Amino acid sequence: GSHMLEADLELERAADVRWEEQAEISGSSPILSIIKNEEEEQTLGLEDGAYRIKQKGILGYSQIGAGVYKEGTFHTMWHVTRGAVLMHKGKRIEPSWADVKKDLISYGGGWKLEGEWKEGEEVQVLALEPGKNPRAVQTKPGLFKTNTGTIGAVSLDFSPGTSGSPIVDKKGKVVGLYGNGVVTRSGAYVSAIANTEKS
């Protein structure tokens, strides 16, 4: 085998994880990224926060997803990294736990995200889309019956490369991550919210 990594996946911090009062007023608001006026996907540029995940190629970096660092643990989607080792400023982060059905993976501990949602509350997607500065978008999840119980979901209203961005409740805690696409009986895909699942 090789002792080098198969892919160079780099983490880049982009925003604090919090509820944004402007987005509660207006429905959406820009978030501070540090001050950056434009995101340049192809360049690269742990503390708690929301990160982009960027893969190196010969043309530069591509943002393949995003995630959240909380309590020494990085959280992202299974589909985004498929368990690949991550790097942040020279530090290697290895996978600790995954649930392929929830499309979740954590690095450097088990799941730490403790947001909550119940029917009729609103949440904010703190979206880190490829090519865009972070934006908080407030939305009301819909409730779904699963074949084992229930789950809330939001509409797939951002780039696929936003997958892993946090979805926060009004306490600033992460109810789930954007981009776990699940199919409805009616044929629609929606983005299911991890912590809202009742099994």
User: Residue written as tokens 């797939």?
Assistant: 156
At 138, list the tokens: 């407030």
Q: 10 Å Cβ neighbour count for 120?
A: 8
Extended beta strands in 37-188, E state = 49-57, 60-70, 73-77, 86-88, 91-93, 95-99, 104-107, 123-127, 135-139, 142-145, 150-154, 166-168, 174-177, 181-183
At 150, list the tokens: 């229930």
36-62 residues labelled b (16+ CB within 10 A) or e (exposed): eeebebeebebeebbbbbbbeeeeebe
- Any idea which residues carry the catalytic annotation? 79, 103, 163
Q: Which residues pair with residue 13 across a beta bridge? A: 51
How far apart, in whole angstroms, are the C-alpha atoms of residue 41 and residue 80?
Answer: 16
Alpha-carbon distances, residue 112 vs 6, 82, 101, 159 (angstroms): 28, 20, 18, 25
Q: Which one-letter DSSP state was computed for residue 89? A: T
How far apart, in whole angstroms, are the C-alpha atoms of residue 113 and residue 108?
Answer: 13
How far apart, in whole angstroms, are the C-alpha atoms of residue 189 and residue 183?
Answer: 5
Question: Which of 162, 160, 172, 168 has its CA nearest to residue 141?
Answer: 168
Start-to-end C-alpha separation, the chain: 41
Question: Which of 158, 154, 88 has its CA nearest to residue 130?
Answer: 158
Question: Which of 24, 68, 19, 61 has its CA nearest to residue 46?
Answer: 68
